[PDB]
Amino acid sequence: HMSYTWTGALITPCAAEESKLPINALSNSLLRHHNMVYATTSRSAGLRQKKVTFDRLQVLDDHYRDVLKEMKAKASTVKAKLLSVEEACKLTPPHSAKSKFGYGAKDVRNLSSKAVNHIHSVWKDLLEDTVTPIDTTIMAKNEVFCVQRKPARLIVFPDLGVRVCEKMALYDVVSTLPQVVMGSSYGFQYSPGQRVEFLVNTWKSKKNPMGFSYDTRCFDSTVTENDIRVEESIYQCCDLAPEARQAIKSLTERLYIGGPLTNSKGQNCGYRRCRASGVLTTSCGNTLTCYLKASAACRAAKLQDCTMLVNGDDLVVICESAGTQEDAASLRVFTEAMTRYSAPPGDPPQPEYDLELITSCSSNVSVAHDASGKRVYYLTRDPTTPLARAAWETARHTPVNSWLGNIIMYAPTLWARMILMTHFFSILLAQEQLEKALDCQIYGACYSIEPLDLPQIIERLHGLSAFSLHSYSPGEINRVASCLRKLGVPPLRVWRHRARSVRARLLSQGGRAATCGKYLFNWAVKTKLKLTPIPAASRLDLSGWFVAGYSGGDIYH
């Protein structure tokens, strides 16, 4: 029961790959330790192949079937709709990988007769054939990190025509089913502020709280045929149109369970028998499976009052403590149950008795103070990877602007405000590109956003307090200052000086640029301006922002 089998053919790139941090005239103003930053390339794909390839053994007990029965009872209350070709076309990212059959993402988005006719023939084939394995492309992802080198992560995806069909059959399912099945445990329904609120309220709801994050080693590879069939039985609980049922069965049999792996040059690389990382159901499938195995493992370990928080393969459990030493033994049993369910740990989970010490989705809760001096909880993270990616983005245009996604998601943080906002607004001002829409990712979905709209976006997600936070915690300040010394990033005092200039330059432009100066950089001036609700923020359509996760799902909003 191997996750993969391989032919020996290489995982090949599509274009030139850079591993060394590109340098330009702007680089040194952000980061001096250039050799610390690198990008993964297809050169390390062979090492990743070794890591992801293993035998999976699964032992399913009564706790597993009991949780699954409860999940199916909730899933049966869901009604989902089939999307039209046209509706599914419009969810396609403008730079999504082109089809092998003579059309691309822009042809799909424009509803070109050629794209639409091929999609209809792919759909008809799904309904008529529920056996033939569907082809997939295997690629090495090019991602930027700081040293201490990771081999490239792999991406496995079917053709563009298949991806549009996945949307038609399952978009409504993967967007609505997880919150119904998992309720408040479904992480992707929350904005960062709502996630903090859920974590704080959960922690407070326990008499003697204990919390831990559970890291599964190579989660996609641990996903078995059983897991993928169990996910399909959950989707099948929904009230569906007859064509959607048939398409879901077909996609499960032909694509989700497994299939051949083809490199960018058209050679057969091998065969997958685990989760494909680049399908519509990757996020929903991972969330459901992680929640199922973990809820079952909690009952096996006799963990009292376990509240889960699940986002794909990312898991946080908050429960009642049985005493520090009993909690450590309880965690070893939870781990043994997860292992029998084919979800062994990367790092062994550690019990935590301080909410701020739990790391989940690379993040943690911290505390600052608003303008009135009131304690305010917010989400932060170690800024090393955001800063390594900002350095890359300073010298190269990339398909996804991580700095923009990081400013959006981490707007209240000391590091996003003082460094990311300051640096990138300075760059945009110099290029007169404040109005230019840029692509970013929020919970795996793609968005096109104008930097000029950041004050309204931030107000809507985090509230006006995101522009007034001060008196950050010593632990947070120390982590940021340490990260800056390690990367050779100028100290926070330099950023304050630069921000005063960026603020003045923005205010000088007037209009929307002045609003950016006023709201984003009020922290930089000694005599602070009174920050009132931005009229434009109320008009924002932010409906599908925090509904579901779509990592690898090829979604554009």
Ligand X SMILES: COc1c(-c2cc3ccc(NS(C)(=O)=O)cc3c(=O)o2)cc(-c2ccc[nH]c2=O)cc1C(C)(C)C
Q: Is 354 annotated as a binding residue?
A: no
Least gap, CB of 223 to ligand X (angstroms): 10
Three-class secondary structure of residue 472 per DSSP: coil
Burial track 182-205 (b if 16+ CB lie within 10 A, e otherwise) = beebbbbbbbbbebbebbeebbee
Q: Determine which helix (DSSP H) or strand (DSSP E) holds 288, and give its type and residue range.
A: helix 282-300
Among 93, 104, 178, 192, binds ligand X (CB under 6 A): 192
Three-class secondary structure of residue 213 per DSSP: strand
The count of residues interacting with ligand X (CB under 6 A) is 22
Q: Which is nearer to ligand X, 379 or 513 (CB)?
A: 379
Among 251, 318, 409, 484, binds ligand X (CB under 6 A): 409
- Residues in 352-371 that interact with ligand X by CB under 6 A: 361, 363
CA distance 217 to 339: 10
Least gap, CB of 28 to ligand X (angstroms): 25
Candidates 158-166, 311-319, 346-354, 497-505 — which segment interacts with ligand X by CB under 6 A? 311-319
CA distance 428 to 23: 18
Q: Is 327 annotated as a binding residue?
A: no
Candidates 20-28, 281-289, 298-306, 536-544 — which segment interacts with ligand X by CB under 6 A? 281-289
- Residues in 379-408 that interact with ligand X by CB under 6 A: 379, 405-406
Among 212, 443, 467, 556, binds ligand X (CB under 6 A): 443
Q: Determine which helix (DSSP H) or strand (DSSP E) holds 382, and give its type and residue range.
A: none
Candidates 282-290, 341-349, 485-493, 525-533 — which segment interacts with ligand X by CB under 6 A? 282-290
237: Cβ–Cβ under 8 A, 6 or more apart, which residues? 72, 75, 76, 78
Q: Which is nearer to ligand X, 123 or 157 (CB)?
A: 157
Residue with structure tokens 């989707």? 235
329: Cβ–Cβ under 8 A, 6 or more apart, which residues? none
Three-class secondary structure of residue 314 per DSSP: strand
Among 189, 252, 426, 441, binds ligand X (CB under 6 A): 441
- Structure tokens belonging to residue 81: 């709709």
Least gap, CB of 189 to ligand X (angstroms): 10
Candidates 37-45, 440-448, 455-463, 520-528 — which segment interacts with ligand X by CB under 6 A? 440-448
Least gap, CB of 381 to ligand X (angstroms): 7
Q: Are residues 5 and 49 in contact, defined by beta-carbon separation less than 8 angstroms?
A: no
Burial class (CB in 10 A: 0-12, 13-18, 19+), 87: middle
CA distance 190 to 211: 19
Task: Give the residue nearest to ligand X (CB).
Answer: 312
Q: Which is nearer to ligand X, 103 or 378 (CB)?
A: 378
65 C-beta neighbours (distance < 10 Å), count: 11
Q: Which is nearer to ligand X, 104 or 211 (CB)?
A: 211
Least gap, CB of 15 to ligand X (angstroms): 24
CA distance 47 to 6: 13
Q: Per rule CB under 6 A, is residue 544 in the interface with ligand X?
A: no
Backbone angles phi, psi at 518, to 5 degrees: -60, -55
Among 13, 211, 312, 383, binds ligand X (CB under 6 A): 312
Backbone angles phi, psi at 308, to 5 degrees: -100, 155
Q: Per rule CB under 6 A, is residue 202 in the interface with ligand X?
A: no
Q: Which is nearer to ligand X, 82 or 138 (CB)?
A: 138
Q: Which is nearer to ligand X, 85 or 446 (CB)?
A: 446
Q: Is 439 annotated as a binding residue?
A: no
Q: Which is nearer to ligand X, 107 or 476 (CB)?
A: 476
Q: Per rule CB under 6 A, is residue 286 in the interface with ligand X?
A: yes
CA distance 282 to 181: 17
Among 314, 327, 352, 459, binds ligand X (CB under 6 A): 314
Least gap, CB of 432 to ligand X (angstroms): 26
18: Cβ–Cβ under 8 A, 6 or more apart, which residues? 39, 41, 142, 396
Q: Which is nearer to ligand X, 278 or 351 (CB)?
A: 278
Per CB under 6 A, residues contacting ligand X are: 187, 192, 195, 282-283, 286, 311-314, 361, 363, 379, 405-406, 409, 441-444, 549, 551
Annotated binding site for Mg(2+): 215, 313-314
